[PDB]
Ligand binder design. Structure first.
Ligand SMILES: Cc1ccc(CNC(=O)Nc2cccc(F)c2)cc1NC(=O)c1cnc2ccccn12
Length: 278
């Protein structure tokens, strides 16, 4: 439940939220899994966190969401078992690739990467599961360009500049957050839509520039205030080179001031799986 002695620890994949991730083998030999083990200096608070993350992840059962295939909690040290995504982090995976002239990635593949995120996000919406932190950095690539949405938290020093940090406040992925999250702390499905819009811009940017990169933290926060004000002073992410106008129009709708005028993930999937092909 699941037998801990069946796990064979092979490499360190990265750090992790409450300890390290290991690539493991299961003889059931190279049936590969990822194993997150609770750090050995891990405080009572991190253990609680780890156990909650276990419960949250047990809910998530979709091809395009990370799967908890197993757990080793019933004895110390605490362990979490997921699929292994061989290409790792989607932001770092895309960062290497260049758009196909006329590692490469083509435009229809960028659509397929996006549609897999639209599908997994559609799944979460049916659970009324609010992600709160959709971005390429929380996505994993397992090939054949198979995308799993995950959540690595907000503490890793690689993506430090992606979060806005105030002493004693919640850590805020502001460049991905809908105006109403920024001003009110209101995370919904509709704000997940907004972040998908930004994630979709990231994919189409091949993860080569930060959303509102040339703007400061403050400026992103006051841009949210420009959305509330509704005076036509709100500034949007520009069209990525790899992005047509038809598709960019869909990114824009994602950032509609009115949450209910943002497209449901069902429509974002229909667009990226069907309409973006024509
Ligand atoms: C083993 C493990 C445990 C916990 C996590 C991160 N928890 C989540 O994603 N929770 C979560 C919460 C809410 C919504 C949601 F959608 C998700 C991830 C992993 N697995 C890896 O880290 C891994 C797998 N393949 C590779 C390849 C390279 C590097 C890392 N990995």
């Amino acid at each position: 439940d699941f037998p801990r002695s069946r796990l064979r620890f092979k490499e360190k994949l990265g750090e992790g939220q409450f300890g390290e991730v290991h690539l493991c083998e299961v003889d059931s030999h190279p049936l590969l899994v990822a194993v997150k083990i609770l750090r050995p200096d891990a405080t009572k608070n991190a253990r609680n966190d780890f156990l909650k993350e276990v419960k949250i992840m047990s809910r998530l059962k979709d091809p395009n969401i990370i799967r908890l295939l197993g757990v080793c909690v019933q004895d110390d040290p605490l362990c979490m078992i997921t699929d292994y995504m061989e290409n790792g982090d989607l932001n770092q995976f895309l960062s290497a690739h260049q758009l196909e002239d006329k590692p490469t990635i083509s435009y229809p593949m960028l659509l397929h990467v996006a549609a897999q995120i639209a599908s997994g996000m559609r799944y979460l919406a049916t659970l009324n599961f609010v992600h709160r932190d959709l971005a390429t950095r929380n996505c994993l690539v397992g090939e054949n360009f198979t995308i799993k949405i995950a959540d690595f938290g907000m503490s890793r020093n690689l993506y430090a500049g992606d979060y806005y940090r105030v002493q004693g406040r919640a850590v805020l992925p502001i460049r991905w957050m809908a105006w109403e999250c920024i001003l009110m702390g209101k995370f919904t499905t509709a704000s997940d839509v907004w972040a998908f819009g930004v994630t979709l811009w990231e994919v189409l940017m091949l993860c080569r520039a930060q959303p509102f990169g040339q703007l400061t933290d403050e400026q992103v926060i006051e841009n949210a205030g420009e959305f509330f004000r509704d005076q036509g002073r709100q500034v949007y992410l520009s069209r990525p080179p790899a992005c047509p106008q038809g598709l960019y129009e869909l990114m824009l709708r994602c950032w509609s001031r009115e949450s209910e005028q943002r497209p449901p993930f069902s429509q974002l999937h229909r667009f990226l799986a069907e309409d973006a092909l024509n």
